[PDB]
A paper describes a structure:
A second extended sheet protein was created by inserting one designed ferredoxin domain into another to create a half-barrel structure with four alpha helices and six beta strands. CD spectra show that the protein contains both alpha and beta structures. Attempts to improve these statistics by rebuilding portions of the model proved unsuccessful, possibly due to a register shift or dynamic fluctuations in the structure (perhaps corresponding to slightly 'molten-globule'-like behavior) that are difficult to computationally model. However, unbiased low-resolution omit maps suggest that the overall topology is correct. In the model that displays the best refinement statistics, the protein backbone was similar to the design model with a C-alpha RMSD value of 2 Å. The fused beta sheet aligns with the design model, while the inter-domain helices shift slightly to accommodate the inter-domain interface.
Here, we explore the viability of such a mechanism by inserting one de novo designed alpha beta protein into another such that the two beta sheets are combined into one. The backbone geometry at the junctions between the original domains is regularized, and the sequence at the newly formed interface is optimized to stabilize the single integrated domain structure. Crystal structures of two such proteins demonstrate that complex beta sheet structures can be designed with considerable accuracy using this approach and provide a proof-of-concept for the hypothesis that complex beta topologies in natural proteins may have evolved from simpler beta sheet structures in a similar manner. Our success in designing larger beta sheet domains by recombining smaller independently folded beta sheet proteins suggests a similar mechanism could have played a role in the evolution of naturally occurring complex beta sheet proteins.
Numbering used by the authors: 1 to 146
The structure:
């Protein structure tokens, strides 16, 4: 009685707005939407990475959630939990922005943990996940439990 959705290496506005609408629909529908966000930064400019950490910590710590991280030399991992789903989309836009500003390499991943929803919702979101994967040519997967 649960559906997860996993997205990675996201594309420009057309995709973000579309995704947002799926995000929106899901929240409305009679269920619990638990979202988790992961980003990994890479680059030799360690000073840049340390600030990219600090901006995302401060912004995302203003939500009723928490933040964890690790630095495997020149690879910084960030795991954000507890954030409202309609904002999540915008924290994605901010972490891409930091990739450009500091001229560093960044990857992004969204985990949506939907609990107790209709099979009509599951099939539509599936079709929307099937659709977006193909139009934008990116990493898209999902899981359903019963």
């Amino acid at each position: 009685m649960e559906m997860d959705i996993r997205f990675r290496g996201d594309d420009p506005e057309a995709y973000y707005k579309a995704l947002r609408e799926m995000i929106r629909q899901a929240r409305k529908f009679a269920g619990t939407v638990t979202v988790t966000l992961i980003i990994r930064f890479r680059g030799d400019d360690l000073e840049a990475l340390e600030k990219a950490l600090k901006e995302m910590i401060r912004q995302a710590r203003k939500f009723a959630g928490t933040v964890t991280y690790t630095l495997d030399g020149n690879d910084l991992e960030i795991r954000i939990t507890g954030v409202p789903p309609q904002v999540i989309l915008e924290l994605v836009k901010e972490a891409i922005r930091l990739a450009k500003e500091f001229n560093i390499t960044v990857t992004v991943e969204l985990v949506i943990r939907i609990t107790g929803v209709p099979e009509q919702v599951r099939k539509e979101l599936a079709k929307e996940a099937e659709r977006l994967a193909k139009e934008f040519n990116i990493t898209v997967t999902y899981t359903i439990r019963l």
